[PDB]
Structures are given as structure tokens and as C-alpha cells.
């Protein structure tokens, strides 16, 4: 019977290849009394989840640790429930702890986390995301993505609505229906603008897979109205963090698809609850992420493969140097492929914690 | 034209005279962050907010980073008169962390009042200087609970907020003891802090009906997000139902109003992120015919003064402002006279009148 006898945290900062419109992460290490160690890594994206590195560090060390230390690994579901009830929000802090527990559970069975969760397949396709910009600049960026082998393109909108509308014209004459578009407004549109955008799209011949979070996260009425109006799948992102949020958008029919992110759910256990609710309601799920470390991408990919989720916006790997992830992931665009025979997730903190 | 040229903070830790226990947590202390904004004319203004992680998710460490590294660049160099625009732009950079926002909003109000040579209460339009509070009673076994209530009554409190929701069997059995021990000149407010399910809540209300008690409110009996159960309880109950954790901000207020999920909202500055957002809630509630009370976390007297100033300006007379009763008198005696159960603002204070710098070392 293994018990968790130690918890450490470390701050990890990673540079981005370009500016997006660095990554701050907290890593946590849990140590069993048999010597096995497990790791989880979460982003501090304050504008979205409200997490800060400083808050996460305090919460893990002073709040979660007293609950976790001395507890049996096999009691993890209860331990995490007890720990998490002491903290409102701070979902990224919860993610880090949840992931480290799964890392331990897998290592105790000498298998990968993906395998622990029931995955067989090793590979998932991601879109590439395109930052907000002027139409011309945006066409170039998309072209670069296509040349890089991506056929699914996430285009950021909502900053300049006229630009978003003009862009569709430019898109229609420069791209075939072999290129598949995903529009993500990040809450930037009102109800009327959203309806306009959808109509504009249909003025053209374009392959558009989804419209993501067009309005404010709390305007569930507008989401439900946009969903009924739309001939294109509507995705809830910020409208759904957790299972109770999922229940609300299901009950109010406010989306066709839920974008599950581990940094919103507070890790894998809660993400599994959302998927189960969505399955029962005939609502589809995709996975997404913050602009976060490859470790978070690997965890998210592991969850998706276990859950039969094939739609993914996992692009941050494209924003960072290959050598960061090359130990556990082969990115042959646009495929994210888990390496064989990893124990747990397969990443280690030696350079951060030890060297 | 005054510009904000400096922002500094300090942690405050205060011991409680007795243990505060709710269905959610137990504590002997208050952790708070204070913030100081300095104008280019040398005038300084202050706000103080609690780190109640189990409730608002705030931590001293998070608040510190948010205020000094996120909010500060937006605030620094800006004109005081631009406060509404500055706060809107700064706050949109941060999801949640409502207490960090409260600290900043309060310091801005302190400056606005000081620049007019008046109190914040005056700035907001208060006429009255006095508000009555209940005293709240920690969860415990029946006998301890009766004793704590007796202590409150002898201290002159006639409105008693009884925490419930930790042990449902105890909550039900307590109602018997209350009926025996106290007259109807004592008014009870029950607060479950989300600890009951729907069936238990109805049973508790049914149970109250079995006795003769003066019961003013039933506060947040179920989970903050179970708005359906809140609406069902509100429709079922002959006692006004109060939303606390279900309402942080104006959009939360809109939802509970639209869903008929409460009769009254408990406004707390640590949830609203300060006075500006609290005013918006009050306006929405007034339009909907929903009443408001003010409340607080177990937090420093500075937050109590700020909250009382707001209530007085908004004609809110129902208050759970008790933390003064849990801490040393000298922590509030600079700005407040507490003649239990009356919170009385001292006269002629400029801004809030917290007098923090005397005892705290503020740092950039």
C-alpha cells in the first residue's frame, strides 16, 4: 500500500517561437513511500482561469499538501475530493495535482497514462491556430500553416468584426474545401454580429467545422439562440469549465460541442465527468488547451485518445522548440503522436528540480 | 488632476477570539492583503480584502501578484478621475480573484473621498451613520451552540445568525433547543453555507414550522450552482431565501432574478470585487423587487467599515457584519464605535479613516 510522503513544486518558464495574440507553468512532484515519483504541469493563465503561479504554489503547498501527505494512493478519488473542496476556482492548481496522481497511478502499473486511461491509439490530429491580424497578414499566416501540412485551421476572430467579415471573402477565393476552418471569437461578438458572420459564411463556399464561443461565457441564452440559428456546430469553451457547467449548457441546449480543457476542468477526473454527461446528451466533445507546455498537451492528448475524442486544438507544440517535447511526442504535422513505452506521462523534471 | 504614482501592499494577519466554524471550513484567524495607492499630490488611499480561498478562491500570494504585476501597469500614471475606465480595463485582465479586485476598488474610493475632503460614506450619499448587525454562531453540538447564542444575547445582539449545514441531524435537533431557550424577541437567520440538499432544506423549513421561532432568513441552503433547487426552495418556503455564494456579481444577480432563485441577495464586497460592482447588483435587485442585505467574509474591520459605508448609502438595513465581535476592539476603534449590536461610523473621517500606515509597512 503506497502512500504519498512528499510534494514539491517548481516554476517552469518556456519561450515561444513568436508572439501570440512565453509560457508560465507550475510543476508539481508527488513522491510515494516506495520511491516512485509523479508529475503534473499546469499553466497560469490568469485572464482565463484566474490562476497565478504564486497562488498555485501556495494552494498546493499549504492547502492541498496537508490533505494529501500520508494518504494512500488507492484513495486518490476521495483525497482529491477532500482537497479540492477547500479551494474555490484555481482550476489550474487542481489540474497540476490531478495529473501528478495519474502519473503515479500509471507508473505503479508500469504503463503510460494513456494506457491507464484505456487508450489504444497513439495519434491525434490538431489544427493550427492563427493570431488576430489584418486580412492580408492573416491570409499569409494561414498559407504558412497549409504549407506546413495542417488542413484544419483555427482562425482567431472577435477583435475587429469588420476584419472578421472581410476575411471570409479573402478566405473563399484563396482556399478550397480541403482546408477546414474553425472560428474562435473568444467571446468577442454580440448576438447580432455572430448571426451576421454565420450568414456571411454561407454567402460563400467554405468548409467550416465549428464556431467557437462567439459570445460572453455567461450569456447562455445567446449561446442557445446562436446554436438553434446556426447551421454550423457551435462550441462552448469558456461557458464550460466543469461538469456542472456542462449540465447547464446541456439543459439549456447552448452548444453542439464542448471544448474540454484540463486547465479549466482541474484535471482528468473532472474532464471524464464532462465527457460522460456530454455522451448521454448526444453532445460532442473536442479537446483544447491554453498556450501551455508540451507536458499539458501530452496529458490532454492522453485523455482524448482514451475518450475517443478526435477533434483537437493542440497547436502550442508548434509555438515551442522541438527538443522540449521530443522525448515523449513526435509532432509530424498535423499529427501529435505519443512515443512508445513511456512510463506514466514520460516527462521528468530533472533539469528544473535537480540540475 | 491627480495621478496615481505608486502602488504598495502589506499583509495583515488577525487572530480570532474564538473559533469560526461553518459547513465549509474552520478557522482561528483572518489573512488579508492591504493596498495603498499614492497620488502625485501625496494623498494616499487604502483598501483591505480577505484571502478566503475556500469561498472566493483568493490567496494573499495571488492577490499580491495580481495587484502589483497585473493591475499596477494599468493603474500607474493614470488620472484619478479615470477610475471607472481604469478599473474596467484592469479587471478584464483577471478572471475571478474578486478579493484582489475589492482591495483596489476600495483604495480608489478612499482617494475619491479624500480628494473631496469627505468620508467614503458621505461620498456615496449616506445620510445615516449607524447599522445593526447580527452575531453569527459557529457550527457545533447543540449545547455549545446554545451557550454561544446566550453569550451573544448577553452582549446585546438580538439577531442571531446560526450556522448550519455541517451536521443535518444536529441542525434539526437544535430547533428544539432554540424554541425552549429563547423568546421571539430573538430573531434567527440560518445559513447552511450550501451544506444541505433539496430534501433536507424542505424538511428543515417544515421542521421550523413545528415550533414557534422568529425566523428572518434561510441563507444559501444548497450548492451555489444549483439554481433549480434554489428556485424550488424559494417557491416552497414561507421564509425569505437568501442567495450568498450563488451571487458574486451583477450577471449572477441577473440569473437568480431570471430564475426566481431567491427573495434576497447577500451582497459582499469580497465577492463583487468592490463597491462599483456592488452598486450594479443593488440596481438590478431594486428593479426586480428583490431585497438586499450586506454580509462579509470573516474579515478585517476595514472591510466591515467599507461595507457599512455602502449599505448606509444604499439604504440596506439588514446586515451580517459580525467580525468586529470576533477581534480585538483596538483594531476598529480608530474608525468605528461598536455599541453592540450597532456599528456606528465615527465622525469627520476623511476617506475611510483606516489609519493603516501607522501599524503596517507598505512595500512596492
UniProtKB/Swiss-Prot annotation, chain A:
Mg(2+) binds at residues 184, 212, 237. Its cofactor is Mg(2+). One of its GO terms (biological process) is peptide metabolic process. Transmembrane segments: none annotated. Binds 1 Mg(2+) ion per subunit. Keywords: Isomerase, Magnesium, Metal-binding. One of its GO terms (molecular function) is racemase and epimerase activity. It is an enzyme of class 5 (isomerase). Substrate binds at residues 129, 154-156, 186, 261, 289-291, 313-315. Its EC number is 5.1.1.-. It comes from the Bacteria. Pfam families: MR_MLE_C, MR_MLE_N. SUPFAM superfamilies: Enolase C-terminal domain-like, Enolase N-terminal domain-like. Gene3D superfamilies: Enolase-like C-terminal domain, Enolase-like, N-terminal domain. Part of a large, functionally divergent protein family. Protein modeling and substrate docking was used to predict the substrate specificity, prior to biochemical analysis. Catalyzes the epimerization of dipeptides with L-Glu in the second position. Has epimerase activity with L-Ala-L-Glu, L-Pro-L-Glu, L-Val-L-Glu, L-Thr-L-Glu and L-Met-L-Glu (in vitro). Belongs to the mandelate racemase/muconate lactonizing enzyme family. This is L-amino acid-D/L-Glu epimerase. It comes from Francisella philomiragia subsp. philomiragia (strain ATCC 25017 / CCUG 19701 / FSC 153 / O#319-036).
Amino acid at each position: 500500500v503506497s502512500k504519498i510522503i512528499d510534494i514539491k513544486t517548481s516554476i517552469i518558464k518556456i519561450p515561444l517561437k513568436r508572439t501570440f495574440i512565453h509560457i508560465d507553468s507550475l510543476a508539481v512532484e508527488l513522491t510515494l513511500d516506495n520511491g516512485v515519483k509523479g508529475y503534473g504541469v499546469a499553466p497560469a493563465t490568469t485572464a482565463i482561469t484566474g490562476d497565478t503561479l504564486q497562488g498555485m504554489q501556495y494552494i498546493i503547498r499549504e492547502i492541498f499538501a496537508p490533505v494529501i501527505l500520508g494518504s494512500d494512493l488507492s484513495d486518490y478519488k476521495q483525497t482529491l475530493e477532500l482537497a479540492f473542496k477547500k479551494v474555490m476556482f484555481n482550476s489550474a492548481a487542481k489540474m497540476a495535482i490531478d495529473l501528478a496522481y495519474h502519473d503515479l497511478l500509471a507508473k505503479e502499473q508500469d504503463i503510460s497514462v494513456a494506457k491507464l486511461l484505456g487508450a489504444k491509439a497513439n495519434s491525434i490530429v490538431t489544427d493550427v491556430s492563427i493570431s488576430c491580424g489584418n486580412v492580408a497578414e492573416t491570409i499569409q499566416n494561414i498559407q504558412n500553416g497549409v504549407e506546413a501540412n495542417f488542413t484544419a485551421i483555427k482562425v482567431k476572430t472577435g477583435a475587429d468584426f469588420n476584419r472578421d467579415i472581410q476575411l471570409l471573402k479573402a478566405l473563399d477565393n484563396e482556399f478550397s474545401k480541403n482546408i477546414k476552418f474553425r472560428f474562435d471569437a473568444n467571446q468577442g461578438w454580440n448576438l447580432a454580429q455572430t448571426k451576421q458572420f454565420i450568414e456571411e459564411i454561407n454567402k460563400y463556399s467554405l468548409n467550416v467545422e465549428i464556431i467557437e464561443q462567439p459570445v460572453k461565457y455567461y450569456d447562455i441564452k445567446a449561446m442557445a439562440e446562436i446554436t438553434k440559428f446556426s447551421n454550423i456546430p457551435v462550441v462552448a469553451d469558456e461557458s464550460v469549465f466543469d461538469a456542472k457547467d456542462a449540465e447547464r449548457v446541456i439543459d439549456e441546449q447552448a452548444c453542439n460541442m464542448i471544448n474540454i480543457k484540463l486547465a479549466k476542468t482541474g484535471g482528468i477526473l473532472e474532464a471524464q465527468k464532462i465527457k460522460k454527461l456530454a455522451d448521454s446528451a448526444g453532445i460532442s466533445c473536442m479537446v483544447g488547451c491554453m498556450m501551455e507546455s508540451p507536458a499539458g498537451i501530452l496529458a490532454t492528448a492522453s485523455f482524448a485518445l482514451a475518450e475517443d475524442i478526435t477533434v483537437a486544438d493542440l497547436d502550442p507544440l508548434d509555438w515551442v522548440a522541438k527538443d522540449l517535447y521530443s522525448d515523449y511526442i513526435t509532432f509530424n504535422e498535423p499529427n501529435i503522436i505519443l512515443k512508445d513505452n513511456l512510463k506514466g506521462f514520460g516527462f521528468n523534471l530533472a533539469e528544473n528540480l535537480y540540475f
